[PDB]
DNA sequence: GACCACGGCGCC
DNA sequence: AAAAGGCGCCGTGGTC
């Protein structure tokens, strides 16, 4: 390409090199743009950012987040990553996409700019005639990248002092547990080492091994195994408590406080847009889509996520979203009727599980019940279910008969979906988002049937993901005009931040946007709460 | 210091 | 652990 002085003409593709992958933390080392057989290299990248109207090219969202961090309103535009991801969601990295569609991902901005231009041309070509994928690109993914950029640069407020204090308290409790574990073993060892624990439980103490690990066939010490052994030796309960506490402390309590950004004073995640097989987003660095919520200590941690002073958090969560999607995709009259009547399948199952009436099902019971509902829907075995519910195998097998019989046209949809996947080599969401599942023709049964479970889960999980993304795209500009903020997405949930005066109006508005995103054969219901912290906001 | 594979486990 | 699916991060163990 012909070397040409900065700045580039408008519509040029950008290339850029960060000192580290996280755009809120990165130094912009270099910046370039490419168009019309030219390549322009910015003498000083930060200053050159101001000359661009739009970030167009590979990882456009990351450069846009960096720009917002610097006070520049630079929105992301076309990104070949989004084109490739729609063509095949195993296209998750620029290294791979480059190799697959016409170049190499190097460490030089000018080369990355040229690459973006070339790859865009080629991938755009491949999407011609693919009208549904085109609609997903233009109406969903592309605008969604702009929304994600704002969410990332905005961040979420965290009560750091609270977490610091919590750490010291959990440390003492952890020591109480580990000391007792060592007393019971008769000697200390690295309790964090599942290999050392394996030998203590199964070789030294006389406990029966229950299961083996997947890759290396060691005797497993997983929570499920320990659960089954909870009454064979008092050390087992202590170990389970130890695991709970150390998991929460090492993953959330200790790391999160150290990740507060000096400029914003908030915590900033990344919402990865080309990272999953089904079309869901993922979150990393840190992952804010797996903040604890179940146990007492977990809830204490979620309480650390708080609203700016003068603001409130608003949490909105789609009700039984994948069951409703299933009703629509399958067209099952019984299931559709359930939602037209306003029934709650999770409460109902929770009612059967704990042997209480529906009004007796508390939040944590209902939670347990959804693991069972989706567990079964997506192929859980009779054997496993009996083990979890701690009931006879015959009771577990029975529950699964009744489950699929109540909703007769589901299996038809599953069989239709699997046959279709075998022929085309891929399955599809409602909107035509694709996932290739070649192992549907595998000759090994365990491999083939695992593939089948992935394949028929995908249209359901993926449609739910399409709906939520579309909702985010419609909702974002409405929040901007009300002076509220979109902060996080957790798959079928959004967390917004609104000024106190407008929080009620924002909650109502967001609820309606989410419910009316794309009407289905059953209503979509959204549960909404308002609060000073994330736990309170989910009520 | 960093990379991986693994087991394990937090959320949806 | 097991015929639920989708993720990312932790510490260990082994390298490099
Ligand atoms: C090989 C087979 N293998 C391997 C593992 C598996 O198949 C893998 C599965 C997996 O990887 N791990 C398994 C589950 C692990 N455990 C717990 C561990 C167990 N230890 C205890 O219980 C201890 C008890 C305890 O301490 N105490 C307190 C001390 C009490 C319990 C959790 O996830 C914990 C967290 C949790 O349950 N959070 C709920 C959940 C969930 C799921 C969601 N979805 C999809 C559809 C939904 O529609 C959509 C939206 O979700 P959501 O909005 O929520 O639901 P709805 O929209 O439908 O309903 P409403 O919005 O109306 O309410 O997402 C799934 O596909 N599967 C799901 O499980
Ligand atoms: Mg939900
Ligand atoms: Mg949810």
Instruction: Spell out the SS3 assignment of A163-221.
Output: HHHHHHHHHHHHHHHHHHHHHHHCCCCCCCCHHHHHHHHHHHCCCCCCCECCCCCCECC
Sign of torsion over alpha carbons A13, A15, A21, A24: negative
Q: A248: left (phi > 0), else alpha (psi -120 to 50), else beta?
A: alpha
A159 and A121 within one domain: no
Task: State, as a whole number of angstroms, the distance between the CA of A91 and the C1' of C12.
Answer: 31
- CA-wise closest residue to A278 among A100, A85, A132: A85
Residue nearest to atom 38 of ligand 1 (CA): A367
Residues A277 and A157: beta-carbon distance below 8 Å? no
Angle between helices A333-340 and A409-424 (to 10 degrees): 120
A368: buried, middle or exposed (CB in 10 Å: 19+, 13-18, 0-12)?
Answer: middle
Taken in order A42, A48, A52, A55, the sign of the CA dihedral is: positive
**Among the three residues A464, A484, A513, which one is the final residue of a domain in this structure?**
A464
Task: Using the CA of A290, give the nucleotide whose C1' is nearest.
Answer: B11
Residue A497: phi and psi, rounded to 5, are -125, 125
Does any strand B atom come closer than 7 Å to the Cβ of A192?
Answer: no
Is A299 within 7 A of strand B by CB distance?
A: no
Residue nearest (by alpha carbon) to ligand 1 atom 47: A322
Residues A46 and A94 in one domain: yes
Say whether the peptide bond before residue A16 is cis (omega within 30 degrees of 0): no
Q: Give the integer Cα–Cα distance in Å for A268 and A260.
A: 8
Indicate if ligand 1 lies below 6 Å from the C-beta of A346.
yes
DSSP 8-state assignment for residue A230: T
Strand pairing report for A157-158 and A493-499? unpaired
**Taking a C-beta distance cutoff of 8 angstroms, is the pair A84, A126 a contact?**
no
Residue A374: nearest nucleotide (C-alpha to C1') = C4
Instruction: Give the HSE-up count for residue A418: Cα atoms under 13 Å, Cβ half-sphere.
Output: 19
Six-digit token string for A475: 């909702």
Listed in order, strand segments (DSSP E) in A246-372 are: 270-272, 282-284, 305-306, 311-318
Same domain, A365 and A226: no
List of A residues 446-465 with CB within 7 A of strand B: none
Residue A83 sits in a domain whose CATH number is 3.30.420.10
**Contact call for residues A267 and A158 (beta carbons, < 8 A):** yes
Q: What is the torsional sign of CA A432, A438, A443, A445?
A: negative
Protein-proximal positions, strand B, CB < 7 A: 5-12
Residue owning tokens 């559709």: A336
- Pairing outcome for strands A426-428 and A157-158: unpaired
Residues A192 and A298 in one domain: no
Q: Whose CA is nearest to atom 61 of ligand 1?
A: A319
Does residue A244 line the site of ligand 1, with CB under 6 A?
no
Pairing label, strands A434-436, A426-428: antiparallel
Q: Which residue has the tokens 């919520």?
A: A293
What 8-state DSSP symbol labels residue A259?
G
Considering the domain architecture, whether residues A24 and A94 belong to the same structural domain is answered as yes
Query: Closest residue to C1 by CA to C1' distance?
Result: A211
Domain boundary among A270, A286, A301: A270
Determine the protein residue whose CA lies at the shortest distance from the C1' of B8. Answer: A222
Pocket test for ligand 1, best of A371, A384, A460, A463 (most atoms within 8 A of CB): A371
Residue A76: φ, ψ to 5°: -75, 145
Rounded CA-CA distance A59/A290 in Å is: 24
A196, A280: one domain = no
Which atom belonging to ligand 1 lies closest to the Cα atom of A492? Answer: 50
Nearest nt by C1' to A458 Cα: C5
Phi, psi of A428 (to 5 degrees): -140, 145
- Spatial contact of A468 and A492, defined as CB atoms under 8 Å apart: yes
Asked whether residue A314 falls in the same domain as residue A328, the answer is no
Same domain, A351 and A280: no
- The boundaries of the domain holding residue A62 are 1-153
Q: In terms of domains, do A303 and A366 share one?
A: no
Ligand 1 atom 15 nearest Cα:
A371
DSSP state of A360: G
A84 lines ligand 1 (CB under 6 A): no
Distance separating alpha carbons of residues A490 and A95, to the nearest angstrom? 27
Is A296 within 7 A of strand B by CB distance? no
- Calpha distance A363→A418 (Å, rounded): 35
- Neighbour-count burial for A441-479, b at 16+ CB within 10 Å, e otherwise: eeeeeeeeeebbebbbbbbbbbbbbbbbbbbbbbbbeeb
Q: CA-based angle A289:A293:A294, to the nearest 5?
A: 130
Nearest protein residue by Cα to C1' of nucleotide B12: A491
Cβ-in-10-Å burial (0-12, 13-18, 19+) of A151 comes to buried
User: Which of A429, A464, A499 is the last residue in one of the domains?
Assistant: A464
| Of A370, A383, A450, A453, best ligand 1 pocket probe by most atoms within 8 Å of the beta carbon | A370
Closest CA to A512 of A469, A483, A485, A474: A474
A457 with A325, same domain: the answer is: yes
- Same structural domain, A382 and A474: no
Please count the structural domains in chain A: 4
Q: What residues contact residue A403 under an 8 Å CB cut-off, 6+ apart?
A: A376, A377
Nucleotide at minimal C1' distance from the A367 CA? B12
A254 lies in the same domain as A117: no
Q: Are A502 and A293 contacting, i.e. CB atoms less than 8 angstroms apart?
A: no
Cβ(A467)–Cβ(A523) below 8 Å = no
Query: Strand, helix or coil at A283?
Result: strand
CA A538 – CA A528 distance, rounded (Å): 7
Q: How was this structure determined?
A: X-ray
Q: Which DSSP letter does residue A156 get?
A: B
CATH of the domain at A507: 3.30.70.370
CA A285 to C1' C15 (Å) is 25
Integer distance in angstroms from CA A57 to C1' B3? 29
User: What is each CA distance from A268 to A157, A231, A372, in whole angstroms?
Assistant: 9, 43, 33
- The resolution, in angstroms to one decimal, equals 1.9
Q: What is the number of the ligand closest to the CA of A489?
A: 3
């Amino acid at each position: 390409l012909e070397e040409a002085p900065w700045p580039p003409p408008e519509g040029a593709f950008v290339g850029f090199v960060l000192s580290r992958k996280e755009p809120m933390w990165a130094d912009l080392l270099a910046l370039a743009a490419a168009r019309g057989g030219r390549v322009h290299r910015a003498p000083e990248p930060y200053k050159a950012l101001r000359d661009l109207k739009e970030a167009r090219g590979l990882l456009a969202k990351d450069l846009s987040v960096l720009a917002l961090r610097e006070g520049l309103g630079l929105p992301p535009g076309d990104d070949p990553m989004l084109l490739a991801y729609l063509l095949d969601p195993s296209n998750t990295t620029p290294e791979g996409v480059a190799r697959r569609y016409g170049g190499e991902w190097t460490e030089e901005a000018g080369e990355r700019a040229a690459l973006s231009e070339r790859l865009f041309a080629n991938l755009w070509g491949r999407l011609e005639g693919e009208e549904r994928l085109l609609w997903l690109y233009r109406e969903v993914e592309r605008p969604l990248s702009a929304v994600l950029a704002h969410m990332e640069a905005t961040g979420v407020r965290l009560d750091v002092a609270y977490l610091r204090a919590l750490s010291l308290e959990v440390a003492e409790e952890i020591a109480r547990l580990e000391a007792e574990v060592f007393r019971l073993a008769g000697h200390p060892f690295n309790l964090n080492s599942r290999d050392q624990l394996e030998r203590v439980l199964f070789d030294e103490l006389g406990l029966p091994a229950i299961g083996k690990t997947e890759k290396t066939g060691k005797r497993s010490t997983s929570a499920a195994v320990l659960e089954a052994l909870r009454e064979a030796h008092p050390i087992v309960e202590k170990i389970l408590q130890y695991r709970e506490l150390t998991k929460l402390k090492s993953t959330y309590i200790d790391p999160l406080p150290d990740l507060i950004h000096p400029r914003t004073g908030r915590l900033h995640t990344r919402f990865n847009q080309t990272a999953t097989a089904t079309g869901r987003l993922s979150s990393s660095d840190p992952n804010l889509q797996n903040i604890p919520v179940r146990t007492p200590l977990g809830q204490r941690i979620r309480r650390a996520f708080i609203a700016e002073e003068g603001w409130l958090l608003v949490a909105l969560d789609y009700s039984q979203i994948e069951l409703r999607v299933l009703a629509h995709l399958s067209g099952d009259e019984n299931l559709i009727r359930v939602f037209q009547e306003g029934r709650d399948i999770h409460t109902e199952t929770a009612s059967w599980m704990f042997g209480v009436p529906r009004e007796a099902v508390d939040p944590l019971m209902r939670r347990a019940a959804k693991t069972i509902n989706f567990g079964v829907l997506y192929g859980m075995s009779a054997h496993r279910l009996s083990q979890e519910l701690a009931i006879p195998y015959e009771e577990a097998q029975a529950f699964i008969e009744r489950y699929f019989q109540s909703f007769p046209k589901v299996r038809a949809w599953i069989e239709k979906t699997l046959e279709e996947g075998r022929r085309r080599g891929y399955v599809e969401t409602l909107f035509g988002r694709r996932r290739y599942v070649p192992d549907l023709e595998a000759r090994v049964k365990s491999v083939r049937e695992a593939a089948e479970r992935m394949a028929f889960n995908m249209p359901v999980q993926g449609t739910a993901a399409d709906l939520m993304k579309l909702a985010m795209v419609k909702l974002f500009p409405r929040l901007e005009e009300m002076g509220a903020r979109m902060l996080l997405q957790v798959h079928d949930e959004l967390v917004l931040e609104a000024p106190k005066e407008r929080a009620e109006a924002v909650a109502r508005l967001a609820k309606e946007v989410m419910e009316g995103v794309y009407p289905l054969a059953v209503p979509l219901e959204v549960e909404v709460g308002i609060g000073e912290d994330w736990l309170s906001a989910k009520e």
